[PDB]
């Protein structure tokens, strides 16, 4: 018995009459490139992607961010081609490249990267970390306003916050220094949330910082809607995600329903959900920038629990499933003597009635 | 499942075959997988120090 294929079978478009005249791969690299392309295409048979690939929603992710900037491609291409000719005209540049002694200035690359592809690389990296999944229920935005956050450590050193680099709770013990480029008359809202810190509700967050109605980039003149609380990742609970979200306001907004007391040391009041906060303010507020870091427990977290939150410190442990053994049988034929130990609770001798 | 077959570049016999294939042709083979049922573990509250 046979069944016809449900679709085009692989290798069907190859004409087998002219096999000798057909071009061969000749190289492992050329076959692999074609093989990788074929693997990514959709197929009508069962595939590894079907069982292991993450089940993304078919509808595209809603964009809730600022409009893309308008660019003149013709003028841009002219200036870019001209700059390359000048670089290549220099004879020392040709010799440094030929002698393999040339290098790129990493600082200048990053500055241009911040203004060009940077926003899309941050969106891609934020998507990988699950920030859009958790903060906006799958809605995405391109962080088009570069957000620079740095924690002051000591007096001469700064610890920057990029997009997933690790910062310790000791370094983040005080509010960070925040700067961005803003026009005069613009209003902004900055918030810090712990995506993974919540000790009670699995889908809830802690609001660590909320500054609203910031004039321009003068963060120190914004209203302290929620005062700064340092991160307190619980010991043994792994690595947490703390995200700074910058919002561009269309108008002055009233955040009286989100105002927290000063100080706010009650974890029930700090319970927060970014999706709900944005949903009610979406008509007058747009996500603009994004920065986040990763945090694990350190000895300063004990101080937050014992002193600031006035509570005992919760300790957690990673517990593995108990090992599987088949049902014990009265005659374990051909099994070693240690078979019996697999079903023993205690190691100390027992004496029964005696 | 059925998956595309890419041999190891050190497997001389298999590499000799794929290099002689007509361009556009991809070999397939049948693969067996195990979809893990349980997570590696869980974080449990052990103390309130």
């Amino acid at each position: 018995r046979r069944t016809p294929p449900l679709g085009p079978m692989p290798n069907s478009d190859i004409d087998l009459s002219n096999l000798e005249r057909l071009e061969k791969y000749r190289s492992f690299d050329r076959y692999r490139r074609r093989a990788e392309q074929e693997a990514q295409a959709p197929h009508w048979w069962r595939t590894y992607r079907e069982y292991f690939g993450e089940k993304t929603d078919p509808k595209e992710k809603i964009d809730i961010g600022l409009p893309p900037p308008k660019v003149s491609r013709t003028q841009q291409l002219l200036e870019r081609k001209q700059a390359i000719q000048e670089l290549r005209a220099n004879v020392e540049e040709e010799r440094a490249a030929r002698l393999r002694t040339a290098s790129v200035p990493l600082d200048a690359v990053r500055a241009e990267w911040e203004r060009t592809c940077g926003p899309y690389h941050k969106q891609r990296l934020a998507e990988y970390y699950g920030l859009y999944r958790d903060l906006f229920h799958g809605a995405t935005f391109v962080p088009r306003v570069p957000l620079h956050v740095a924690y002051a450590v000591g007096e001469d050193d700064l610890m920057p916050v990029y997009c997933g680099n690790e910062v310790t709770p000791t370094e983040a013990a005080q509010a960070p220094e925040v700067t961005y480029e803003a026009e005069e008359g613009s209003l902004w809202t900055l918030l810090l949330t712990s995506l993974d810190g919540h000790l009670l509700e699995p889908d809830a967050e802690y609001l660590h910082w909320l500054l609203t109605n910031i004039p321009g980039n003068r963060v120190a003149e914004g209203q302290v809607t929620c005062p700064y609380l340092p991160p307190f990742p619980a010991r043994g609970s792994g690595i947490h995600r703390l995200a700074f979200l910058l919002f561009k306001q269309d108008q002055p907004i009233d955040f009286s329903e989100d105002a927290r007391p000063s100080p706010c040391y009650q974890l029930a009041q700090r319970t927060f959900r970014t999706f709900d906060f944005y949903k009610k303010h979406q008509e007058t507020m747009t996500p603009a920038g994004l920065s986040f870091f990763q945090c694990r427990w350190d000895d300063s977290v004990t101080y937050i629990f014992h002193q600031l939150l006035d509570m005992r410190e919760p300790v957690f442990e990673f517990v593995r499933p108990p090992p599987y053994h088949p049902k014990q049988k009265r005659f374990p034929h051909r099994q070693p003597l240690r078979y019996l130990d697999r079903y023993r609770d205690s190691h100390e001798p027992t004496y029964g009635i005696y | 499942t059925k998956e595309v077959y890419v041999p190891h570049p050190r497997n001389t016999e298999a590499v000799d075959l794929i290099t002689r294939l007509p361009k556009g042709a991809v070999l397939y083979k049948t693969f067996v997988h195990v979809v893990p049922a349980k997570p590696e573990g869980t974080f449990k509250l052990v103390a309130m120090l």
């Binding site: 046979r2 069944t3 692989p10 290798n11 048979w45 | 075959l17 002689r20 070999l27």
Partner: peptide, 21 residues
Amino acid sequence: YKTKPTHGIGKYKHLIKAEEP
């Protein structure tokens, strides 16, 4: 498997020249 529509998806020797001394 023979009965299934994916029968023969792994066929390759028809794509190579017959080299049989």
